[PDB]
Structures are given as C-alpha cells and as structure tokens.
Scaffold this active site. Structure first.
Site, PDB file in Angstrom:
ATOM      1  N   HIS A 181      71.227  73.235  49.626  1.00 24.20           N
ATOM      2  CA  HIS A 181      71.577  74.629  49.385  1.00 24.20           C
ATOM      3  C   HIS A 181      70.408  75.580  49.612  1.00 24.20           C
ATOM      4  O   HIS A 181      70.620  76.798  49.627  1.00 24.20           O
ATOM      5  CB  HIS A 181      72.255  74.818  48.016  1.00 24.20           C
ATOM      6  CG  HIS A 181      71.314  74.952  46.854  1.00 24.20           C
ATOM      7  ND1 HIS A 181      71.020  73.908  46.001  1.00 24.20           N
ATOM      8  CD2 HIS A 181      70.646  76.027  46.370  1.00 24.20           C
ATOM      9  CE1 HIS A 181      70.190  74.325  45.062  1.00 24.20           C
ATOM     10  NE2 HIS A 181      69.952  75.611  45.258  1.00 24.20           N
ATOM     11  N   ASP A 238      73.470  67.237  47.761  1.00 24.31           N
ATOM     12  CA  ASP A 238      72.624  68.432  47.881  1.00 24.31           C
ATOM     13  C   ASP A 238      71.184  68.002  48.163  1.00 24.31           C
ATOM     14  O   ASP A 238      70.305  68.001  47.295  1.00 24.31           O
ATOM     15  CB  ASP A 238      72.734  69.276  46.616  1.00 24.31           C
ATOM     16  CG  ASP A 238      72.077  70.631  46.759  1.00 24.31           C
ATOM     17  OD1 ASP A 238      71.752  71.030  47.899  1.00 24.31           O
ATOM     18  OD2 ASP A 238      71.897  71.313  45.724  1.00 24.31           O
ATOM     19  N   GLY A 295      65.380  79.542  41.663  1.00 25.04           N
ATOM     20  CA  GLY A 295      64.033  79.600  42.180  1.00 25.04           C
ATOM     21  C   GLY A 295      63.268  78.300  42.045  1.00 25.04           C
ATOM     22  O   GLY A 295      62.321  78.063  42.803  1.00 25.04           O
ATOM     23  N   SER A 301      65.164  75.683  42.391  1.00 24.32           N
ATOM     24  CA  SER A 301      66.072  74.970  43.280  1.00 24.32           C
ATOM     25  C   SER A 301      65.319  74.284  44.407  1.00 24.32           C
ATOM     26  O   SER A 301      64.428  74.868  45.025  1.00 24.32           O
ATOM     27  CB  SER A 301      67.043  75.987  43.884  1.00 24.32           C
ATOM     28  OG  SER A 301      67.508  76.865  42.869  1.00 24.32           O
ATOM     29  N   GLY A 302      65.696  73.037  44.678  1.00 24.50           N
ATOM     30  CA  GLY A 302      65.066  72.238  45.706  1.00 24.50           C
ATOM     31  C   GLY A 302      63.833  71.479  45.270  1.00 24.50           C
ATOM     32  O   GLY A 302      63.399  70.571  45.990  1.00 24.50           O
TER      33      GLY A 302
END
Ligand SMILES: [Ca+2]
Length: 223
Positions: free
Chosen positions: A40, A84, A175, A177-178
């Site tokens: 994402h 994801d 933020g 995220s990942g």
C-alpha cells in the site's frame, strides 16, 4: 508510533524512510540492494533514505538512493490488504556500516507473546496529528490469532497478525506504514493497517513476513 519512545539515533539501522518529496512510509533494508515495505506504500519516483534519525535535517550518516524497481506482491489486494508486501530495488547498493545495516529474514514464524520492536516516523497521536522529527520505537507483543480475529472479525487472513495492546494507547500509526516489526532479530512483520491508532480493542495489524520468504528470495534472485 503512539505511546512509544525515541529509539536513539541509528539504533534501528535497517529502518528506512521512503521519500517522494516528503516522508510517506517506512521500510526495512534486507540486503545492500533491497528494501521490504508494504504494497500500500507503492508509488513511482521513490527515493530510499537510509541512515536517518531526524528526517528533517541532514545529520551526516544518511544515504539517499533512488528506487530502480518496485515489485508489488502478485496477490496484493488493496481492498482487504491481503498480501500487503512490496520489494524495492535500489539503483545502487547501499554502503553497509554501523548505522546502515540489513535485517535478517525469518526462517520460522514468530510466536504469540513475543515482544517485537516496531519503529517509524508516523503520527504520535491517537487523536489529532503530531509527527516526530526523530525515529520512534515501540515494543509490543504478538497477539494470539484468536484475539486478533476477535478484534477484527471477518478481516484477518493467514497473511496477517496482530501486535500491540488491547487496552489502547500504544500502537503504530499512519506514516509508520511499511516499516519493520522485528522479533528476535528477524523481520517478522510490516506495518500494514488498523482501525485508527492506539484504540481500545483495535491493535495493529501486520503483514506476516514469514509467509513471503520464498517469494522474496526468488524475486531477488531474478531482478
Ligand atoms: Ca536526516
């Protein structure tokens, strides 16, 4: 990261910031040429920033390297966030040192109850918005599959796990995220999703990296 602590400069040397004119996602350096992040977080024109602590100030240990290729998992579904995960190849190999270092992929999945290190530059407020300058950290335990499914009925697949605190107050957030979830020195999760941040009975949901090691290795061997 809501309810966490300041990591300490370069103490999480596999943590990267993905920059497209601004920080927008985290990632994890898995060798000198490859970063794992969330699908994402995909976009074109990514610059990978390694060796960062204060993301707003050049402090002297950074390496900025453009992504040359981004590979989104073949089965990534953005509606459910199943699978994801994405791989980012660097245009040139990073120089590994004490402040820029790779994190090992797992050989086995992690266990419920294990405390893992989650890190990033995401929002630090569970309501409202406040973004930190320096890297933030959170130690959070892996929750049982049954408790995870009870918190998110109808939404947890075998490629996800929950970590955090059902009482609220401590979680990753937008933020982050990942970015990495590291347990026993292995990359076991990717910051993926959740309902709000740090909300009661709504822990963080993370991509289950151990399910993807074969795909990662094959992809790296062919790109
Ligand atoms: Ca910096």
């Amino acid at each position: 990261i809501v309810g966490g602590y300041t990591c300490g400069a370069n103490t999480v040397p596999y943590q990267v910031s993905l920059n497209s004119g601004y920080h927008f996602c985290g990632g994890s350096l898995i060798n000198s040429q490859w970063v794992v992040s969330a699908a994402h977080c995909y976009k074109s024109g990514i610059q990978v920033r390694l060796g960062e602590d204060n993301i707003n100030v050049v402090e002297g240990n950074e390496q900025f390297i453009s992504a040359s290729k981004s590979i989104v998992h073949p089965s990534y579904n953005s509606n459910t966030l199943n699978n994801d995960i994405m791989l980012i190849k660097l245009k040139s190999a990073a120089s590994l040192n004490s402040r820029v270092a790779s994190i090992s992929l797992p050989t086995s999945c992690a266990s419920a109850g294990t405390q893992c290190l989650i890190s990033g530059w995401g929002n630090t407020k569970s309501s409202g918005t406040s973004y930190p300058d320096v890297l933030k950290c959170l130690k959070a335990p892996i929750l049982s599959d049954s408790s995870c499914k009870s918190a998110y009925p109808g939404q947890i697949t075998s490629n996800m796990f929950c970590a955090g605190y059902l009482e609220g107050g401590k979680d990753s957030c937008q933020g982050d995220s990942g970015g990495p979830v590291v347990c026993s020195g292995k990359l076991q999760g990717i910051v993926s999703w959740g309902s709000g941040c740090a909300q009661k009975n709504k822990p963080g949901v993370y991509t289950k990296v151990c399910n993807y090691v074969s795909w990662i290795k094959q992809t790296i061997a062919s790109n």
